[PDB]
Every structure is written in C-alpha cells, then in structure tokens.
Amino acid sequence: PGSQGAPGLQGAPGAPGSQGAPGLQGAPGAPGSQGAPGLQ
Amino acid sequence: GSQGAPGLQGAPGAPGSQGAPGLQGAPGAPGSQGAPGLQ
Amino acid sequence: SQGAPGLQ
Amino acid sequence: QGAPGLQGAPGAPGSQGAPGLQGAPGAPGSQGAPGLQGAPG
Amino acid sequence: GAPGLQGAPGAPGSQGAPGLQGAPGAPGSQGAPGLQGAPG
Amino acid sequence: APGLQGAPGAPGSQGAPGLQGAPGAPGSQGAPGLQGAPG
C-alpha cells in the first residue's frame, strides 16, 4: 500500500549532467603581427 | 503489493544544465609589428 | 514491502 | 496503476547537441606584405 | 493487473549525452609573410 | 506483475554532446612582396 514502485523517482541524475568545468575559449584572441617597426 | 518509492531522484538536476561558458576572452590584440615603420 | 525499502 | 512504474514514456535517445565551439579558425591566407624600398640609394 | 512493466525504459537511445555532434570546421588562415627584405 | 526495469516510466531522455568545432588555421593574409618598390 505504501507507494507503488517509484520508477527512479522519474530520474536520479541531479547535478551530474550539469556544468562540468570552465572553458579555455576557442583561442584567447591571437595578437596581430607585432615585432619590428623598422625605420630610421 | 505496495512497492514503495525507493527511486533515486535528481534527474531534473541534469536537464542538459550546461555551464561551460559560451563566449569570453574571444578577441586578442598585439599586432603592430612595424606599423611604426617611421622612415 | 509496504511503504519503502528503508531509503528515500 | 496495475503496473507500477510500467513501460512509461520512451525516449532517451539523446538530442544531438550542437558540436562544441569551432576549432582554431583563421581567415585562410598568408599575411604577406610587400617589402620596403628596394634599390638602397 | 501487471504490477511493474517498463523492464526496458521506453526508448533510450543513450539515456544520456549521446556522441558529440559534428564539430564546426574552423577556417584555416595562414601565417604573416609580411614585409620582406627589399634589395631592389 | 512485471518488473519496473529500464528507467523512470521508460527511459530518461537526453542530448548528445557536441564535438568541439573542428579547428582551422588561424593566421593573417597579405601580399608578401619582397619590396614595395626599389629605392
């Protein structure tokens, strides 16, 4: 009589199945072509 | 006969709840190689 | 097996 | 019900979530630049 | 009548996070063959 | 009276992750002339 077999209480996985870890970005924007401003 | 409700719960805690960032730090900068070619 | 298996 | 739990609602195929962000992209081409004054003087 | 059922859960293709989808193809730029030596 | 096997009322659906976009080749474009003009 006490509850008719809750099927996985509709689902177990809580926080598991959420954000896992911060990203590192496609690439921290690659600096342009720097170097020598040859002159003088 | 009964069967209770032992079931583990929490599935809603993982409803595709992605947290991995979408966009941040994308662009860069340093690119003036010789733009100051200055004669 | 009446109300639950000693764990929710 | 006369089938606790019971077959229930099918479906755990897994939506084909969008592929992660692009790989290392780049405007296809070589950043060429013509040189400088040629004949020195 | 038939206490139970769902022995196989409905239709779980994976029940979680199937294989990752086709990663976008990042464009391929090339190096910076910028200013070159100017013998002239 | 069958079993309640499988998953909560049948399976818990989900979403296939996405493969991190295929790389490319970062860089820059230009005309790599050896000299703009002889002096």
Side-chain angles (χ1 to χ4, degrees), chain A residues 4-8, chain B residues 3, chain D residues 1-10, chain E residues 1-11, chain F residues 1-11:
Chain A
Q4 208 194 86
Chain B
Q3 306 195 7
Chain D
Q1 189 252 324
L6 186 135
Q7 177 52 251
Chain E
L5 210 50
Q6 72 185 356
Chain F
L4 288 76
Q5 309 270 113

Side-chain angles (χ1 to χ4, degrees), chain D residues 4-38:
Chain D
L6 186 135
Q7 177 52 251
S15 64
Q16 296 299 109
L21 180 148
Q22 268 286 6
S30 88
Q31 193 277 310
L36 193 50
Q37 179 176 359

Side-chain angles (χ1 to χ4, degrees), chain F residues 6-39:
Chain F
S13 185
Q14 78 277 3
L19 285 171
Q20 171 64 5
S28 179
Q29 299 65 62
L34 210 73
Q35 85 280 22

Side-chain angles (χ1 to χ4, degrees), chain E residues 10-39:
Chain E
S14 307
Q15 267 288 79
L20 275 71
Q21 279 58 241
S29 196
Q30 279 71 252
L35 186 67
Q36 269 86 12

Side-chain angles (χ1 to χ4, degrees), chain A residues 16-40:
Chain A
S18 312
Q19 165 56 347
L24 276 296
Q25 158 179 2
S33 51
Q34 275 191 348
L39 73 165
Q40 55 98 15

